[PDB]
Amino acid sequence: KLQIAVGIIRNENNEIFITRRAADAHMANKLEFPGGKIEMGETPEQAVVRELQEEVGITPQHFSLFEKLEYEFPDRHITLWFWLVERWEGEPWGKEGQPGEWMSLVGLNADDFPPANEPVIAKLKRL
């Protein structure tokens, strides 16, 4: 059972900053919204801020919870907190050496992301 906070970073051109997971990680090689595990003593709002600062070097500001869902993977159960981030300080980049780039929302392919993201990718194509 893991609680994961991730940020959907959208610019004014309806593009999202997406990174790719390592070949040796769970959901290897999949595209993803930057994020990570919510630690003990930390709230989901604080988690997404810390995770984005760590992973892509930006500080999320005035964000909202776009979606919260639970997904059962073959060996783990995770609760995902998808935060819509439209304002932030900094310029997103591959701060941890991971691949990262802007992707048009209309071009996103749910099959490229973990299956847990399916409903979120779909909903995004409408916001």
Ligand X SMILES: OC[C@H]1O[C@@](CO)(O[C@H]2O[C@H](CO)[C@@H](O)[C@H](O)[C@H]2O)[C@@H](O)[C@@H]1O
- Please report where in the chains the tokens 């984005």 appear, as a residue: 52
For residues 5 and 121, which CB has a smaller minimum distance to ligand X in the complex? 5
The answer to whether 4 touches 26, Cβ cutoff 8 Å, is no
Asked if 59 touches ligand X (CB under 6 A), the answer is no
Q: Which of 63, 66, 81, 82: binder of ligand X (CB under 6 A)?
A: 63
Asked if 45 touches ligand X (CB under 6 A), the answer is yes
Report d(CA 28, CA 104) in Å as an integer: 22
33 is in an annotated binding site: yes
Asked if 57 touches ligand 8OG (CB under 6 A), the answer is no
Q: How far is CA 64 from CA 72, 97, 119, in A?
A: 24, 27, 17
Q: Which of 64, 76, 96, 127: binder of ligand X (CB under 6 A)?
A: 64
Cα R_g (the chain), whole angstroms: 13
DSSP category for residue 116: G
# of chain residues touching ligand X (CB under 6 A): 5
Sign of the CA dihedral running 79, 12, 101, 104 = positive
Distance of closest approach, residue 112 Cβ to ligand X, in angstroms: 27
Asked if 87 touches ligand 8OG (CB under 6 A), the answer is no
Which residues belong to the annotated binding site for Mg(2+)? 35, 55
Which residues belong to the annotated binding site for 8-oxo-dGTP? 21, 26, 32-35, 117
